Amino acid sequence: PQITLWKRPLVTIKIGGQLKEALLNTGADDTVIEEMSLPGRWKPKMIGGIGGFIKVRQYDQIIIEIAGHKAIGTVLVGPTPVNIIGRNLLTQIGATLNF
Amino acid sequence: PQITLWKRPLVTIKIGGQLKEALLNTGADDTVIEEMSLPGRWKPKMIGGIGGFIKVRQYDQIIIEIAGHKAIGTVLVGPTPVNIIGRNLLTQIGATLNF
Ligand SMILES: CC(C)CN(C[C@@H](O)[C@H](Cc1ccccc1)NC(=O)O[C@H]1CO[C@H]2OCC[C@H]21)S(=O)(=O)c1ccc(N)cc1
Ligand SMILES: [Cl-]
Ligand code: NA
Numbered sequence: 001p002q003i004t005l006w007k008r009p010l011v012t013i014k015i016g017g018q019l020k021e022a023l024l025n026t027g028a029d030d031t032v033i034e035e036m037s038l039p040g041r042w043k044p045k046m047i048g049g050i051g052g053f054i055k056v057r058q059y060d061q062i063i064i065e066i067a068g069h070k071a072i073g074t075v076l077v078g079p080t081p082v083n084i085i086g087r088n089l090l091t092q093i094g095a096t097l098n099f
Numbered sequence: 100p101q102i103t104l105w106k107r108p109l110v111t112i113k114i115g116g117q118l119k120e121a122l123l124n125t126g127a128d129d130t131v132i133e134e135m136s137l138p139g140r141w142k143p144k145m146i147g148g149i150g151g152f153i154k155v156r157q158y159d160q161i162i163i164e165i166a167g168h169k170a171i172g173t174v175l176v177g178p179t180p181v182n183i184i185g186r187n188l189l190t191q192i193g194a195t196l197n198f
Contacts, residue, residue, distance in 0.1 A: 003196040005186040009125050024196055026108055027124030027183060032149065049149025050131070050179060069198065080149055084126060087104040095198040097102040097123055099168070099189075 001067065002098075013083065014065040015075070020083055022066070026097055028086030031064075032076040038062060045076060054078055069093035100166075101197075112184065113164035114174070119182050121165075125196060127185035130163070131175045137161060144175060153177050168192040 003009050009024040016038065030047060042057040056078030064071050066085055071092040102108045108123040115137050131146065141156040155177030162171045165184060170191035 001196075001198060005125060005189045005194060005196070008128070008186075009196055023126050025124070025126030026104060026196070027122050027126045029107070047149060048180060050146065051148055051151030051153055054150050067198075078149075081147065087107075090104045090198075093198050095104060095196055097104070097108055097125070097194055098197050099100070099166075099192050099194040 011067040011085070013067075013085070015062065022083035022085050024066075024090065024095065025084040025086055026090065028084045029088065030076050031074065031084060031086045031089050032056065032078060032080040033083045034080060035077060038075065038077065042077075047076065047078075064089065066093050110166040110184070112166075112182070114161065121182035121184045123189065123194065124183045124185055125189065125194075127183050128187065129173060129175050130185045130188050131155060131177065131179045131183045133176075133179055133182055135176060137174065137176060141176075146175060146177075153179065155179075163188060165192050 013022045038059045045056050045058040046053050056076040059075050062075045071089045112121045137158045141158045144157045145152045155175040159173050161174040170188045172187045
């Protein structure tokens with residue numbers, strides 16, 4: 001796809017069998033999803049956004065489908081205003097910015 | 100150009116006579132720049148993301164040069180940790196996400 005930016009670049013994702021909406025976010029180093037259950041152990045992470053730093057749960061090697069594209073990588077879980085797909089998974093699906 | 104997302108998509112911008120580095124941010128509706136003076140009227144706004152909200156000044160009809168391409172639109176000025184070029188200006192330079 002070639003996605004223009006007149007609207008939010010929202011796509012459907014699938015994680016743990018569940019469809020969710022998420023924003024493709026070139027401004028995010030990391031993928032951050034709202035509270036949900038994920039398998040395995042997690043490790044601590046602090047991430048800094050516009051308003052300050054927060055604690056999140058870091059899960060590694062999570063299978064996620066993004067707009068029909070398969071990715072396997074790190075997902076952060078915490079109080080984000082919207083689910084965000086960051087560069088760690090945008091690279092896996094081959095996304096680029098073009099102008 | 101085509102910008103890969105292995106690293107943060109940083110570009111040079113010219114705004115208010117000043118060169119700055121900024122992040123191309125498809126996850127942001129509005130452009131937000133670190134504290135600086137801009138001409139004309141403004142009004143206060145609150146914007147929020149991970150870690151909460153910050154108060155900014157909203158300036159309308161500001162010209163920015165983004166990696167060489169001139170665009171005009173609203174610029175928010177405030178204590179953002181990173182200068183961010185949001186969709187409101189990315190659209191004007193014809194930026195798309197491709198995968
Ligand atoms: C949270 C998003 C819905 C919205 N944001 C833009 C977003 O891309 C920020 C943009 C950004 C980038 C760096 C620092 C602050 C904000 N990225 C961000 O918080 O990413 C976090 C997850 O990965 C980590 O990598 C970057 C910080 C972490 S935001 O900065 O909160 C925001 C809200 C409204 C406007 N107009 C502009 C920005
Ligand atoms: Cl267009
Ligand atoms: Na103005």
